[PDB]
């Protein structure tokens, strides 16, 4: 068939390896991994032959692909004549999360069998220790293949002293997957969140780090369980600020407050704002309402649709991928309008936005919690959040503007089902428990908790995981992880179209929410299907939303657990107590608390920010 561009090819990769054309082999491997990255794990459009038995068996074909690719990478990286360049190593660190899955979704688990070929010390105390010859080539190959699922010992202080850039690059790579759930991967990331911030702080630029996964580092620390998990963000901001200044940046001087139609100007900088996205559903009504106090200028990408653009008085596209040009365009927009407020409803999904948060454009700079975590930025004054979603204020470096619980009325998805079907089983022989969670939300604590519920419950249970982001070569690994805790008592469903996803959940008798990072959309889905479930609460907003939303929707407090032991007890109770469970489901079906999420007075955000501006003006005399 005709296509836009030649597909990356396993055959061409293998051929280059055979010919010891190392440059062409590296190029083909990077092209394969980059295309997988583009398609979020899907391997369509990567060329390979396979036995005809696998034509209709997608999971088996994916494992075959991962196995074949693992074999080829083994042949290449074990070759002592293969010399990896520094720019080569940098490109591999950016896609290490995909390398991980090539091994982790194969039967091999990891690339440790390659690492073992690099050991030069026959007198080692442990097979888990790898001693390298003192050349940068073997150190880089070691580090590139030190994967999340590796069982090899690595002492970070040792690596740091040997080569800071390689050490830092590996630490980025190990933070960057969207599934860091296994004991081995979660343990590495855990250790990094404690050890790495004081080291990362020492970098002055991002030039020798894998820059393209910086925003993943920024976002992903929120899925760890440590109280101080967001510390790496403070460190990353310092590096970003330094990097920005070393590119010649100068902060805007605030000398005037511009007016348009007699109102001060709010510039809104958007990461995702298509009307099909959550952030539009959660945050658009309060922006529209703020036009009563401010003139709103929205800056977003080409992909924003008309409904998205229309929330603003005027809208401008960000032309291209260059971050300096974006900040320059934003700077000129704030200068031209003498902007009063800079608002970012989400920060973290784009590196450009993180740069923005580390510079001065307007006297009041504000985020909302599209990604629910503190910035640790010195340049962000305020966070907009619903009062009932806040746990501890100490989780944020910013000052929280705690709005009324109805101040951000949601807009319903247009894909919302209109003729929901209900299965209310009176006395099921097996209680089917649905878990709607992106892979980022899975971790050993959560899985161990489910295992305990299974082992202690006096009813039989089966866990159905509806796994957002478990796509293509991600899936076997995630499935094996689940199996390692729950055996035959769980089913791992790949990321699916919305209707399939709702079919999976609707056949469950109850749901359980992940922790520490809970759900929002998944709770909406739950009550849409007339289901009930248990959640865990805690101090972060991303821990506490579930509690607030359950209360908004009229679910009772016993379903909201403080400790892990509490969660276990409440989950068992909901599973065992068939009549109690069905009564709550009848409450939810009849009450339709969902409709109340779409109502509220949206004016507080505008009014609160206007009051803050007033106070700023009379403090500063501008
Ligand atoms: O197999 C699947 C899994 C999920 N979904 C859909 O995806 C929704 C869940 O959204 P995501 O997959 O993006 O997961 P989250 O709800 O955790 O994500 C949302 O909340 C985040 C903050 O935690 C960010 O704001 C993110 O961009 C936003 O989508 C579900 O309600 C459903 O509509 C499917 O259709 N099929």
Author numbering: 0 to 621
What does the paper say about this structure?
Soluble HMW1C-like N-glycosyltransferases (NGTs) catalyze the glycosylation of Asn residues in proteins, a process fundamental for bacterial autoaggregation, adhesion and pathogenicity. In contrast, NGTs are two-domain enzymes that consists of an N-terminal all-α domain (AAD) and a C-terminal catalytic domain that adopts a GT-B fold, as shown for Actinobacillus pleuropneumoniae NGT (ApNGT). We focused on AaNGT, an inverting GT that catalyzes the transfer of Glc from UDP-Glc to Asn residues in the consensus sequence Asn-X-Ser/Thr. The heart-shaped structure of AaNGT, either complexed to UDP-Gal/UDP-2F-Glc or UDP-peptide, shows the N-terminal AAD domain and C-terminal GT-B fold catalytic domain, which is composed of an N- and C-Rossman fold subdomains.
Having characterized AaNGT with different sugar nucleotides, UDP, and the peptide FGNWTT, we obtained P212121 crystals of AaNGT in complex with UDP-Gal, UDP-2F-Glc, and UDP plus the peptide. Overall, our results of kinetic and binding experiments indicate that UDP-Glc is a preferred substrate of AaNGT compared to UDP-Gal, whereas UDP-Glc mimetics act as inhibitors of the enzyme. In contrast, the UDP-Gal and UDP-2F-Glc pyrophosphates are only recognized by the side chains of Lys440 and Asn520. The sugar molecules interact with the side chains of His276 and Ser277. Furthermore, the Gal moiety specifically interacts with the Gly369 backbone, while the 2F-Glc moiety interacts with the side chain of His370. The superposition of all ligands for all three structures (AaNGT/UDP, AaNGT/UDP-Gal, and AaNGT/UDP-2F-Glc) clearly shows that the sugar moieties of UDP-Gal and UDP-2F-Glc collide with Gly2-1 and Asn30. This suggests that the sugar nucleotides adopt unproductive conformations in their respective enzyme complexes, which could explain why we were unable to get a ternary complex resembling a Michaelis complex at a structural level. Furthermore, this could also explain why UDP-Gal is a poor substrate, and UDP-Glc mimetics are inhibitors of AaNGT. The interaction of the 2-OH and the β-phosphate group could explain why the enzyme cannot recognize UDP−2F-Glc in a productive manner. Likewise, the interactions between OH3 and OH4 of Glc with Leu368 could explain the poor interaction with UDP-Gal. The results of our ITC experiments demonstrated that the product of the reaction, UDP, binds to AaNGT ~ 3–5.8-fold and 18-fold better than UDP-Glc mimetics and UDP-Gal, respectively.
